[PDB]
């Protein structure tokens, strides 16, 4: 239900496949801070 | 670390009330990048800047 709420908000109250996929992507990307930091560290070579 | 980010930082510094030049802003941007110790990443710690 929470995911459907987020999808409706991102799609203007309609749960289309695009809206749900965008909601899932946004939910994953919201918790991506540690992943972003690790990825940029490995790209720079901080963690080899 | 992008020119758009440098322009945003300069605009933020101007909004804070400071007077800055292109050379000074570029030096601040490079020093922030150095402090983060990453080539393509500048330090987001705006308190130290």
XYZ file of C-alpha atoms in Angstrom:
97
model
C 0.000 0.000 0.000
C 2.862 2.401 0.748
C 4.461 1.608 -2.613
C 1.106 2.123 -4.343
C 0.743 5.473 -2.572
C 4.183 6.547 -3.786
C 3.367 5.375 -7.320
C 0.080 7.299 -7.294
C 1.858 10.436 -6.072
C 4.517 10.126 -8.776
C 1.893 9.364 -11.434
C -0.821 11.772 -10.348
C -3.081 9.256 -8.618
C -2.967 6.626 -11.387
C -1.023 3.375 -10.963
C 0.418 2.836 -14.420
C 3.280 0.426 -15.050
C 5.561 3.408 -15.670
C 4.418 5.031 -12.417
C 5.007 1.862 -10.389
C 8.429 1.298 -11.965
C 9.401 4.904 -11.226
C 8.188 4.486 -7.639
C 10.302 1.343 -7.206
C 13.329 3.081 -8.718
C 12.852 6.100 -6.442
C 12.455 3.896 -3.357
C 15.676 2.045 -4.169
C 17.501 5.267 -5.061
C 16.447 6.968 -1.812
C 18.468 4.386 0.146
C 21.394 4.585 -2.302
C 23.640 6.967 -0.323
C 25.988 4.244 0.909
C 25.880 2.642 -2.537
C 26.667 5.980 -4.199
C 29.578 6.611 -1.826
C 31.012 3.122 -2.337
C 30.617 3.342 -6.122
C 32.324 6.731 -6.340
C 35.089 5.494 -4.027
C 35.728 2.451 -6.234
C 35.568 4.615 -9.370
C 38.134 7.042 -7.951
C 40.091 4.088 -6.589
C 39.689 4.869 -2.900
C 38.622 1.228 -2.484
C 40.407 -0.847 -5.120
C 32.621 18.342 -9.848
C 31.133 20.220 -12.806
C 31.078 23.841 -14.012
C 27.355 23.883 -13.200
C 28.215 22.940 -9.613
C 30.843 25.701 -9.513
C 28.261 28.232 -10.709
C 25.775 26.993 -8.101
C 28.394 27.334 -5.356
C 29.255 30.843 -6.541
C 25.598 31.828 -6.533
C 25.196 30.406 -3.033
C 28.220 32.380 -1.822
C 26.783 35.530 -3.411
C 23.436 34.892 -1.703
C 25.262 34.472 1.616
C 26.382 38.110 1.269
C 29.957 37.667 0.031
C 31.666 39.324 -2.933
C 33.633 36.823 -5.006
C 35.649 36.815 -8.223
C 36.057 34.131 -10.870
C 39.588 33.354 -9.711
C 38.611 33.197 -6.050
C 35.586 31.018 -6.785
C 37.701 28.687 -8.933
C 40.325 28.455 -6.180
C 37.617 27.656 -3.617
C 36.212 24.982 -5.948
C 39.642 23.404 -6.461
C 40.391 23.516 -2.724
C 37.041 21.861 -1.984
C 37.880 19.139 -4.504
C 41.293 18.678 -2.872
C 39.785 18.437 0.616
C 37.437 15.689 -0.581
C 40.567 13.990 -2.013
C 38.638 12.989 -5.140
C 39.257 14.228 -8.678
C 35.635 14.401 -9.869
C 34.036 15.097 -6.463
C 34.061 18.364 -4.520
C 33.496 18.636 -0.780
C 29.823 19.127 0.065
C 30.715 20.276 3.605
C 29.503 23.835 3.123
C 30.296 24.875 6.707
C 34.043 24.475 6.138
C 33.800 26.201 2.748
